[PDB]
């Protein structure tokens, strides 16, 4: 076995920006990695394709994954609405870490964030499950559209996504 690689094609107000691919650490957090992988292929009949990054704060992170309400309040996992914090083995060590957003202990759904800096205050509270493999320059380009309070100036969407490996 090998860790799955999934990709997102990002568009800015409908114009293609580029592809970011991610390695998911299924060897360390199998349940959390599987949730993100199945939401990226859309194989359960719902997922990330066509959803947006609703909150981007330059120097911190890009947050997305609300494919139900689309405004930052929704999303659901493939296990039902929410699931537990699988473990906190991995930390938020630098740019490119993929981690889960939540509303406290054991509330993981589908929303996630890509870190653009080390965010150690989130360690032990948000489950790290992947990292950017290629396309960190597209994540950096995305940051230019965010703001200190998180609203974006352009609509940043996942135009397409799926599994490569």
């Amino acid at each position: 076995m090998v860790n799955p690689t999934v990709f997102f094609d990002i568009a800015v107000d409908g114009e293609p920006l580029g592809r970011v691919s991610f390695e998911l650490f299924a060897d360390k957090v199998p349940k959390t990695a599987e949730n993100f992988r199945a939401l990226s292929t859309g194989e359960k009949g719902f997922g990330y394709k066509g959803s947006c990054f609703h909150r981007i704060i330059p120097g911190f992170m890009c947050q997305g994954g609300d494919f139900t309400r689309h405004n930052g309040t929704g999303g659901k996992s493939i296990y039902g609405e929410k699931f537990e914090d699988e473990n906190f083995i991995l930390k938020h060590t630098g740019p490119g870490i993929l981690s889960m957003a939540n509303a406290g202990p054991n509330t993981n759904g589908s929303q996630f964030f890509i870190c653009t800096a080390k965010t150690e205050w989130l360690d032990g509270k948000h489950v790290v499950f992947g990292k950017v493999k290629e396309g960190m320059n597209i994540v950096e380009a995305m940051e230019r559209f965010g703001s200190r309070n998180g609203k974006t100036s352009k609509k940043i969407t996942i135009a397409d996504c799926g599994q490569l490996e």
Partner: peptide, 11 residues
């Protein structure tokens, strides 16, 4: 501040 939540986003 700098949190990443779903529901009540804080400062």
């Amino acid at each position: 501040x700098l949190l990443v939540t779903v529901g009540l986003v804080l400062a």
